[model samples]
Target: MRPSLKTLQEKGLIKDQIFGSHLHKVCERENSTVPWFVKQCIEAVEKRGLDVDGIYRVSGNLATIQKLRFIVNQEEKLNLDDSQWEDIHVVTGALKMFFRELPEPLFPYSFFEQFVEAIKKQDNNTRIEAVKSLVQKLPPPNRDTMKVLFGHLTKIVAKASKNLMSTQSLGIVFGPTLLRAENETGNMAIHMVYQNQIAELMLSEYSKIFG
Candidate 1:
């Protein structure tokens, strides 16, 4: 003999309630607040003899999202090694493909902007490495965009490989100074951190040509 569901649960059914309520009431949920609420919501649910809503309100597929999020969160918490970094790269690659597969007009720009800002503030070496990892995991020719986007990192890798020319890897050492010059000093030849600006004055005008 088997016990009834409520009996196993050790709770009386709602029909037995003195309040005369059959369907238990849940607090009213507001739409605008749903985005904030979904993150903290239930993991599983059932309705009308069907498991139609297991982990509803998920941003996308719950299983994949939870799996990726768990690995990512644990990796960050534990400060993962190179192999773990590879795992993270694979998961991010899947997500990028998923995003591309979506119907026209992806989510609002702010969503992507937030993610970009997070990557930008990350350790430069880690960001570059992770992106390279992502590129490798990506399918054939489709990953060229990543190569084009991060062409600057190639310089660093080449310098590390010891192919310095007669110029002696000037691009490797001077790249950051060049980036900082126009950004900060409004001129090229941005001095090194240890230098107090050498005797170079007068800005030479330069412009980028866009095709």
Candidate 2:
């Protein structure tokens, strides 16, 4: 069992905020998987803008990000609701950092080709149904978290005019981290293209596909 955020805070494992106005780590979390943490990061950015100039750019704290990297590498949990993670950049940096440090990609190897096939479907309805069904077959943590993340992303998409984010931009930011092929082949490039397209497609019709 993992220690709770409050436990780590009490142990003084989490650090204090260096910046007066910005947030820092407050408590450790329980059952804090990478996807769960990513959702938290997205929520932080959505709920509060962490942009330095009120734009899409995330102005992050280097030291705080490094601390988060260490914590995630050690499989330690941190509280996202804490004031420490209030900064959108800190959470954004932590989100990407966690994905970088992850031992395995969010999309399982077994499902990689399946997703590719789903993306190759000619009919949009068939494509969505195939992908959604495949997503349902994913392991619990990935399945539930991915669905929730997609739903949140739909909300973000709806707010794109204000947030300055587009589906293409989101695909660029999230593509590599969310999907990975175990082996590279001649078709790897095509597969990557499909992977990004599928993710964007899922986000585009999130309610129809996942709801």
Candidate 3:
């Protein structure tokens, strides 16, 4: 059999200068809780891509994503609206890739279990507040960045009628991307459900959890 497409893609997954830096360290270097490209990508998307069908769900061309990654790593200030980035999905895809490349996701490892635990509570309000307290406990960089990130996502959910990206859809996209798996969960697919649920909860109650 020929080489699998998955293998081919993995082969070219480039690590630009900024790709694997720890989230907190990157924030400190830039003097902003949110990474600069994050704000840039969000602004670019909100400027023109919010109403695009399946905004974040659609993958931009991988080569273009890697190219954009190159520009960012070079510390070149980007004008994302330039004709070079006309396909809005490229901007949206680039944002998700940024989060994916972080050495640790926006959710820190020590707090992952607590978030999973909170999402399992029986009472709805209890669940929300449990998560809210946990959100408060995160290191300042994680907390602030997660808040701004989800707040941006909530805007996307608000436009779901046009974008068709419901809270659940976003949960599925971000769940695995932002969360770490529990070591003992063993059943990886089931972990996906919990991840999806917690992410969905975060988006559906963005105000309650992070407000």
Candidate 4:
């Protein structure tokens, strides 16, 4: 079940009325959809030019965390343009964390195997085509959001050689975090392997596959 304000507050995930109210606003505005928030984060990062190399070193402070909370809550029209690069980094991480913590991942429960099958196609060209077809079939915000996110990741991959961020490493980090089945049974391990493979393939052939 989706988390509620009462549960979050009782669990200490939210500490005050203002925080709870903002989270409620976020859920309401985004229709409790993770992709919408992810799109918001990507825009925030792009708007502030926070796509630099080695940005992962920057930690998010409490103030910026609260600011991000407020922003995601749609309480203000402010963008992170004037904010520090570190704050942007933190917000990006926060966005990823939000997706990670969801009860259901962004790809939805039903399409997990379809994505896995698409990735298992014999050749890269075939694989790309299959995945592209699947991507086209995704829901509105998911389709657009995945396109935007992959585009951003492609930029990151472009600088991978210089940044020491290999496709394998990126896969390892984003694989399970970005996709998963609702009820992972005996195939959990196998599913994760496929997830990493798909992530790597998507990054490697980003322009070909996603473009």
TM-score per prediction, in order, is 0.17, 0.71, 0.90, 0.71
For model 3, what is the alpha-carbon lDDT of residue 26?
A: 85
Across 1-211, the per-residue lDDT of candidate 1 in tens digits comes to 8678578436533222111111111012222211111111111111110122211111244455444444432333322233432323233232332323322112122232232333354464454443344335533322332232123223323343333221223332322322222233433343232111100100000011000
The lDDT values for all models are: 0.26, 0.64, 0.86, 0.65
The residue ranges of model 1 lying beyond 4 angstroms of the native Cα positions read 1-121, 148-211
What TM-score does candidate 3 reach? 0.90
Q: Top model by TM-score, which number? A: 3
- Highest-lDDT candidate: 3
Q: Which residues of candidate 4, in runs, are more than 4 Å off? A: 1-40, 43-67, 82-85, 181-183
Clashes of 4: 0
**1-211 in candidate 4: lDDT tens per residue?**
9789799868866544223333234445557523455666677766653445543334457566656665554445545565453457676666666656555565666777798889888888899999888877876555555667777766666675554556787777678767854247767678779888987887788778667
Residue runs of model 2 more than 4 Å from their true location after superposition: 1-36, 50-63, 71-86
Model 1, position 200: C-alpha lDDT score: 10
lDDT of 1: 0.26
* C-alpha root-mean-square deviation, each candidate: 23.0, 8.3, 5.4, 5.9
Candidate 2 residues 92-191, lDDT tens each?
Answer: 7766655544456667767887888998998899988999999889776666667766776676667777777777766656666577552446577776
lDDT of 3: 0.86
